């Protein structure tokens, strides 16, 4: 009302997206008008197409870029600022958007022009990045069904449309299920063991639900299923009945009634298999592997190698917990269950290493963590990062915005950071997303390149009262992880937009720079630069750092097996499993767990209903990508170990090489080749095993 369609924020030229002025009401008109314009642009491209950059690749990027940026900003708002109105609007336009993506991807004039470039007599003279681009476009067109005759084509497109709808539904159900659970505790006794920080959070939560007399010390408390609330309960609640209840609630999220994801999963797997068959593959995992470094065989081999290396340690971890609980006179030591594991692990960790998480929190405040992280980035990669709040519109008052500068003081990139748990409207977990890519084609008139912009999103414990966000070590690692992704997007030296940043990096290599960054949390200079008391300003005592260092490999076997269980169940569901038979996804879960867990899952276990990585994310038949890339990240880190981590000259020289290979080259060179350029040789799994004490 009262504004023209032509003034819709989604239709404007912008440097930074209008995150402060876009809502549900803009989505239907904006997306539908945009799609009409992109249709006309595609028609013009197809009519004039030649196998050259100006006549094919440049006009293609302009179309792809506009849709990616605008849809990206809408989907980002869905992820961080969900509303019923925004859900409805996205649902309403999603089929039109998907129809256009299929139309574009299945363009025969575009595909034929790319094949002509591939078939050029001087192909070998084309730059590696441009060769990678052409090869990717050809492969992607076949994977989006371009080779199918019109009847099989129609079936393929119906499958794509339904999968898109189901993945959105899956994620909405997960958000809604996490949102729904509320445990009100009145009796002070039932919350025995919960530390001041958790009490302070549960009370702050109680205030927002009406209980205005609620304090941390005395007033009522609300327990929720988002991570910053859920974890402290499982770690610290002495009331075993409370642990079992909260555990069972977490484990059954989105698994019954209106929010049930079971049938959605069943349909997703059915459609994925139908898609695989249409494309001439045996199963969906083979489809997934087409764009990955791995094959089904090689992924399974790595998982089995890591599983074999982890099993004995995981068994010993279990025995250690039993022994410790028994030595405390704990009645449940004779019958330890899944709702005892986290609790007794924490008690064991406290006793064995003499470190208490609550006492560490004052040393890990977000502002100091960011300062230390930026200092590390300067040391390794030669970049200066500074606050730039006000330059770009944001969607929430807690969102930080930063400018990244090179050594000459020239901006090279920007990023947003949305750090705190906000379960009413914001997806759980942590992630990085692209905002705009580094691109020559999308540059402003006069300048050579559009600078890249990234999102980092975490869900860490929110600030309590007036104090800064005080963090756990895991939360620190999570920030370093997402920053690693942001760096690969931001520090890319490719100006070929379609292979810049993280684009066209085989999915099983994208977790390299992220997991790589996590290693530095244990690097003494880095940890000490971060760990300053938020009030006092005093540096973490040396003796405490040594305890943190000692605890690094605690339960590494168990942590490893847990990841391998996730990766193995993913692979199994997309290879051997056939939907529609008497066997359920939970039967698959039980079978795979025999070799990847020391005790069976509960029969009531419904973790699959919240496994968004594989049902509403990029990791379907691909969760193994974490461990695949962790071999790479650990080995990359071992180059610094070899060079001398106590030698700042060596650290900077090695950091520069990492900056100029892994962070610079995007998908413009095969990831194995990029890795070899950095490492000097092909990867070894020895560093990964050594770092985790599993040799």
């Amino acid at each position: 009302s009262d504004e023209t369609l032509s003034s819709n924020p989604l239709l404007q030229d912008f440097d930074f997206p209008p995150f402060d002025s876009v809502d549900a009401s803009h989505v239907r008109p904006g997306i539908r008008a945009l799609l009409q314009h992109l249709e006309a642009e595609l028609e013009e491209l197809e009519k004039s197409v030649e196998p050259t950059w100006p006549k094919l690749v440049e006009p293609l990027e302009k179309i792809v870029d506009r849709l990616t940026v605008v849809w990206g900003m809408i989907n980002h708002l869905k992820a961080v600022k969900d509303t019923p109105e925004l859900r409805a609007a996205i649902e309403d336009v999603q089929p039109e958007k998907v129809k256009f993506q299929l139309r574009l991807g299945q363009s025969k004039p575009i595909y034929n022009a790319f094949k002509a470039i591939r078939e050029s007599p001087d192909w070998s003279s084309l730059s590696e990045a441009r060769q990678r681009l052409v090869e990717a476009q050809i492969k992607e067109a076949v994977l989006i069904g371009i080779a199918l005759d019109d009847e099989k084509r129609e079936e393929f497109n119906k499958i794509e449309q339904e999968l898109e709808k189901l993945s959105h539904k899956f994620s909405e159900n997960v958000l809604d299920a996490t949102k729904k659970f509320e445990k009100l505790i009145t009796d002070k006794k039932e919350i025995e063991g919960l530390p001041p920080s958790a009490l302070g959070l549960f009370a702050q939560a109680a205030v927002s639900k009406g209980h205005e007399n609620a304090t941390a010390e005395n007033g009522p408390w609300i327990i929720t299923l988002d991570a910053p609330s859920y974890l402290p309960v499982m770690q610290h609640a002495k009331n075993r009945a409370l642990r079992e209840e909260v555990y069972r609630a977490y484990l059954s999220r989105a698994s019954s009634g209106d929010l049930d994801n079971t049938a959605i999963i069943d349909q997703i797997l059915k459609l994925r298999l139908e898609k695989a068959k249409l494309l001439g593959y045996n199963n969906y995992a083979e489809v997934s592997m087409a764009m990955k470094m791995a094959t089904v065989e090689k992924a399974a081999e790595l998982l089995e190698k890591l599983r074999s290396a982890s099993w004995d340690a995981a068994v010993q971890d279990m025995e250690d917990l039993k022994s410790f609980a028994k030595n405390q006179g704990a009645a449940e030591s004779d019958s330890m269950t899944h709702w005892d594991t986290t609790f007794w692990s924490e008690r064991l960790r406290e006793s064995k290493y003499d470190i208490n998480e609550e006492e560490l929190r004052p040393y890990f405040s977000l502002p100091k963590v960011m300062d230390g992280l930026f200092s590390l980035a300067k040391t390794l990669f030669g970049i200066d990062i500074e606050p730039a709040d006000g330059l770009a519109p944001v969607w929430n008052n807690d969102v930080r915005f930063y400018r990244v500068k090179d050594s000459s003081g020239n901006p090279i990139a920007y990023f947003y950071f949305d750090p705190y748990s906000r379960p009413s409207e914001k997806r759980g977990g942590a992630w990085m997303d692209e905002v705009v890519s580094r691109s020559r084609v999308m540059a402003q008139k006069g300048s050579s390149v559009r600078l890249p912009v990234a999102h980092m999103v975490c869900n860490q414990t929110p600030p309590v009262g007036d104090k800064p966000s005080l963090m756990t070590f895991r939360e620190v690692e999570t920030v370093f992880h997402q920053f690693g992704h942001a760096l690969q997007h931001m520090l890319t030296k490719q100006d070929e937009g379609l292979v810049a940043g993280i684009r066209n990096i085989e999915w099983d290599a994208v977790e390299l720079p992220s997991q790589f960054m996590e290693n530095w949390c244990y690097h003494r200079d880095t940890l000490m630069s971060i760990a300053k008391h938020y009030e006092t300003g005093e540096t973490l005592p040396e003796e405490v750092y040594k305890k943190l260092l000692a605890a690094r490999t605690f339960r590494a076997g168990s942590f490893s097996l847990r990841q391998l269980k996730f990766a193995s169940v993913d692979l199994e569901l997309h290879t051997k499993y056939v939907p529609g038979g008497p066997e359920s996804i939970y039967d698959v879960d039980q079978r795979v767990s025999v070799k990847t867990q020391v005790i069976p899952p509960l029969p009531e276990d419904r973790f699959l209903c919240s496994f968004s990585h594989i049902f509403a994310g990029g990791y379907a038949a691909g969760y193994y990508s974490y461990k695949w890339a962790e071999v790479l990240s650990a080995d990359a880190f071992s180059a610094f170990e070899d060079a001398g981590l106590d030698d700042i000259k060596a650290v900077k020289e090695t950091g520069q090489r990492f900056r100029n290979t892994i962070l610079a080259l995007g998908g413009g060179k095969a990831p194995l080749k990029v890795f070899v350029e950095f490492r000097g040789r092909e990867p070894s799994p020895e560093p990964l095993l050594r770092h985790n004490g599993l040799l």
Binding site: W431, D433, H485, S514, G618, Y619
Partner: peptide, 4 residues
């Protein structure tokens, strides 16, 4: 999304 590059998750974690």
């Amino acid at each position: 999304a590059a998750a974690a």
